Amino acid sequence: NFSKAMSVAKQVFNSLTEYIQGPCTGNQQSLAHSRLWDAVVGFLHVFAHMMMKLAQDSSQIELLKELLDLQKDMVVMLLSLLEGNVVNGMIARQMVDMLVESSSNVEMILK
Asked: Got the DSSP string for 34-55?
């Protein structure tokens, strides 16, 4: 059930990248003024805690692989929102606040 839920989440993140990749400024601006950040904050929290819990066990290696590739597709989506950004841009400043809110969960990932 965890595997299939992540499988769907991979496709939905990959679709969102397609809409913005090749700077589509309007599509990038739309995803800014939306609830995408809330889904981004929530996914980081689940990612961080599931990483450490599943790293421990030797029977969760396969599930940890699914969580690993899913998080890679998510950050690729965040990078796509930054294509063509200017300094002090709307999309970049709103992206900082998301990282500020999820600072604790980012720290657990980086270690």
From this structure: SSHHHHHHHHHHHHHHHHHHHH
